[PDB]
Amino acid sequence: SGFRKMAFPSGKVEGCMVQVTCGTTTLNGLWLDDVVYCPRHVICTSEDMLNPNYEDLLIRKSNHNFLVQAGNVQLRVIGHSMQNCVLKLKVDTANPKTPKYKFVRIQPGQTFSVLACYNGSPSGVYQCAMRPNFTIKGSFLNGSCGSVGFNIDYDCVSFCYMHHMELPTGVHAGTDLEGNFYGPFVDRQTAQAAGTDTTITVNVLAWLYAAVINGDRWFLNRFTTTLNDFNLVAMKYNYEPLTQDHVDILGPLSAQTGIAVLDMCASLKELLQNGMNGRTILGSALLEDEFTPFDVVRQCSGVTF
Amino acid sequence: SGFRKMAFPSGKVEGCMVQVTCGTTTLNGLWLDDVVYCPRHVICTSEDMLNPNYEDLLIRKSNHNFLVQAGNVQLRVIGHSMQNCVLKLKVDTANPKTPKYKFVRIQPGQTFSVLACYNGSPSGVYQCAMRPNFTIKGSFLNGSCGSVGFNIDYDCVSFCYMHHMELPTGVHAGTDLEGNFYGPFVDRQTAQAAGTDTTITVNVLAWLYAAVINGDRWFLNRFTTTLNDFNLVAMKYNYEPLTQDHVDILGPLSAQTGIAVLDMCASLKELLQNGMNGRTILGSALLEDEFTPFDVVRQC
Numbered sequence: 097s098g099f100r101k102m103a104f105p106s107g108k109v110e111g112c113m114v115q116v117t118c119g120t121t122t123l124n125g126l127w128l129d130d131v132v133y134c135p136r137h138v139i140c141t142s143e144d145m146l147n148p149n150y151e152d153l154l155i156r157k158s159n160h161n162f163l164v165q166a167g168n169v170q171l172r173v174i175g176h177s178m179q180n181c182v183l184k185l186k187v188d189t190a191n192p193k194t195p196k197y198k199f200v201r202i203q204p205g206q207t208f209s210v211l212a213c214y215n216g217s218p219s220g221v222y223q224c225a226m227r228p229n230f231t232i233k234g235s236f237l238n239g240s241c242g243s244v245g246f247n248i249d250y251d252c253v254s255f256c257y258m259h260h261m262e263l264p265t266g267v268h269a270g271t272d273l274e275g276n277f278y279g280p281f282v283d284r285q286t287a288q289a290a291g292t293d294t295t296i297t298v299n300v301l302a303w304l305y306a307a308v309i310n311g312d313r314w315f316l317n318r319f320t321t322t323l324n325d326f327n328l329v330a331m332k333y334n335y336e337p338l339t340q341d342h343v344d345i346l347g348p349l350s351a352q353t354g355i356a357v358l359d360m361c362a363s364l365k366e367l368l369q370n371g372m373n374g375r376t377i378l379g380s381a382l383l384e385d386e387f388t389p390f391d392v393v394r395q396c397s398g399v400t401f
Numbered sequence: 402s403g404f405r406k407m408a409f410p411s412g413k414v415e416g417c418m419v420q421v422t423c424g425t426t427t428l429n430g431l432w433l434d435d436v437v438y439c440p441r442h443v444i445c446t447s448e449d450m451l452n453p454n455y456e457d458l459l460i461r462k463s464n465h466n467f468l469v470q471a472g473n474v475q476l477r478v479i480g481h482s483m484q485n486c487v488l489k490l491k492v493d494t495a496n497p498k499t500p501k502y503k504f505v506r507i508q509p510g511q512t513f514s515v516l517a518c519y520n521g522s523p524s525g526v527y528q529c530a531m532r533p534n535f536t537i538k539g540s541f542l543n544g545s546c547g548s549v550g551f552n553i554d555y556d557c558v559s560f561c562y563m564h565h566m567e568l569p570t571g572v573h574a575g576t577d578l579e580g581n582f583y584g585p586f587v588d589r590q591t592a593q594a595a596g597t598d599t600t601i602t603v604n605v606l607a608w609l610y611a612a613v614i615n616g617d618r619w620f621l622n623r624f625t626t627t628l629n630d631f632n633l634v635a636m637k638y639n640y641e642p643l644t645q646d647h648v649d650i651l652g653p654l655s656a657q658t659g660i661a662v663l664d665m666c667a668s669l670k671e672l673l674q675n676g677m678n679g680r681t682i683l684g685s686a687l688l689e690d691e692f693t694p695f696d697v698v699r700q701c
């Protein structure tokens with residue numbers, strides 16, 4: 097029993113965290129095989145960040161300008177290239193701790209674990225979701241740039257995020273491991289704002305199924321709804337539309353609990369129009385949307401890595 | 402900016418997780434140097450759960466009864482001993498991945514990270530607090546016994562918990578790494594119940610300071626209170642008494658935000674009286690009590 101916000105074990109990623117220093121800027125790098133990946137803004141000054149030409153700044157750099165430190169060992173940079181908003185520093189040594197890995201770009205609503213690092217040293221791990229507005233509500237201070245987001249598939253690490261910046265609202269923006277930003281963001285000191293956020297509906301439903309598996313049933317009702325009627329209500333409360341793909345993904349939880357997805361949608365509809373009435377679900381007074389249907393199955397069935 | 406429930410990176414602990422099998426029972430063990438630590442109930446059968454005599458059961462066991470598996474390698478048990486509710490299995494190989502470590506027994510209110518394991522394999526990491534009733538509100542299934550709770554101090558792992566059982570309410574009970582249970586619990590199937598839980602007041606205050614550091618100030622008021630008047634109010638909401646030790650511990654956060662502890666106590670009393678009124682604090686509609694003053698300073 098119990099339901100917690102749970103991250104993947106971070107060990108396979110900890111062995112890849114290195115410190116990257118370029119001039120006065122120090123941030124984190126991901127060392128996989130003989131390449132260290134990090135945000136390309138490491139080559140910037142405070143003036144450069146205002147309106148940067150990264151090709152012109154990088155062409156002025158030499159390999160010896162980048163100081164890469166893995167633990168108490170300095171790696172020697174033998175090449176440098178840029179892929180979108182990520183800098184790739186070729187090193188002479190392949191990371192012996194390199195796990196089986198993939199670079200994957202995730203969709204909004206998908207969750208992943210963040211290994212927050214400072215000076216190439218892992219300080220914490222937390223689970224979060226890529227919001228529908230493409231920001232992540234992370235926890236990061238200055239020095240955390242280059243911290244990575246990941247999932248674990250059997251024994252394969254899927255790297256899906258690299259932290260680049262904090263928006264004025266305190267939310268975070270970053271890229272996949274190919275340097276492509278999630279969202280309409282750029283890596284420059286300019287006026288940027290996150291769009292209005294919405295609730296990840298499929299994840300709320302998956303969390304309601306986790307509550308039922310844990311014995312919380314007060315919110316269940318006799319009612320069902322059409323997918324269309326549910327979406328009209330959901331859209332009114334800034335909830336993401338629930339697609340037939342989402343209904344199919346919730347299939348196993350629906351079969352396990354005996355509550356059809358559209359039957360759980362009617363519970364969610366009433367929760368939205370009426371509130372919780374001083375009650376909680378899994379010790380929460382708000383509907384939790386940072387657990388995917390896969391996370392719920394993984395936690396309520398004990399899948400290991 | 403931002404405030405998250407954050408666990409310590411679990412890598413140093415993952416390299417110590419092994420599978421321990423004794424007869425039909427399989428659970429997790431912690432392999433440090435040449436010793437594998439696990440709950441002693443791994444030696445129990447069906448008739449040995451209501452009233453087990455662990456000394457009697459362990460004396461009947463031999464080293465070859467214990468199957469220890471680290472990854473796809475079987476370790477050879479060369480000795481066995483019992484320390485309180487923990488079984489110590491001496492093995493013929495020292496764990497090369499053994500980190501710098503300490504065994505620390507924590508107090509209620511303290512937080513730690515849990516590396517939940519099944520069959521000696523880590524499946525997830527999450528953050529817990531030792532509740533004032535000495536239980537932990539974990540997320541554990543059958544097979545998770547031997548999963549450990551820990552904190553990391555620079556590069557040193559302080560092991561503070563080993564999971565032993567689930568109480569009828571779905572909460573969890575375990576021991577420190579010396580086998581001493583937290584709480585009035587025993588490793589028997591006898592009728593056991595967690596005491597009435599209370600909110601960790603010092604942690605709620607630390608979390609209110611984290612909210613102020615993050616820019617959330619709506620809950621602040623012009624009032625202050627005496628420690629005694631705060632405790633009389635707090636007790637009525639099932640909140641733990643706030644001691645002078647707690648007030649002293651909140652000193653650095655009080656100095657950083659400019660809000661005296663007793664001033665923040667008055668904000669907490671007002672929240673307990675009014676509720677949140679559709680508002681949230683750090684994205685939460687409830688007062689969070691699983692962040693200690695030390696966690697808040699570290700994260701902020």
Ligand SMILES: O=C(Nc1cncc2ccccc12)[C@@H]1CCN(Cc2ncc[nH]2)c2ccc(Cl)cc21
Pocket residue numbers: 137141142143145146236237238239240241260261262282283284285402
């Ligand atoms: O925002 C940044 N990273 C950080 C990541 N996570 C949390 C943070 C919390 C506090 C401070 C910084 C955080 C960095 C440093 C700050 N500034 C602003 C700027 N102005 C001139 C040069 N840098 C910018 C602007 C754009 C970009 Cl891509 C990156 C950055």
Ligand SMILES: O=C(Nc1cncc2ccccc12)[C@@H]1CCN(Cc2ncc[nH]2)c2ccc(Cl)cc21
Pocket residue numbers: 097442450541542543544545546565566567573587588589590
């Ligand atoms: O409770 C236990 N671990 C578990 C840990 N975490 C989550 C769980 C979820 C579901 C089932 C078991 C969980 C273990 C195995 C079961 N039983 C209860 C029992 N023993 C004989 C008859 N019923 C006992 C009893 C005492 C002790 Cl010390 C340990 C244990």
Ligand SMILES: [Cl-]
Pocket residue numbers: 345348389390393
């Ligand atoms: Cl599924």
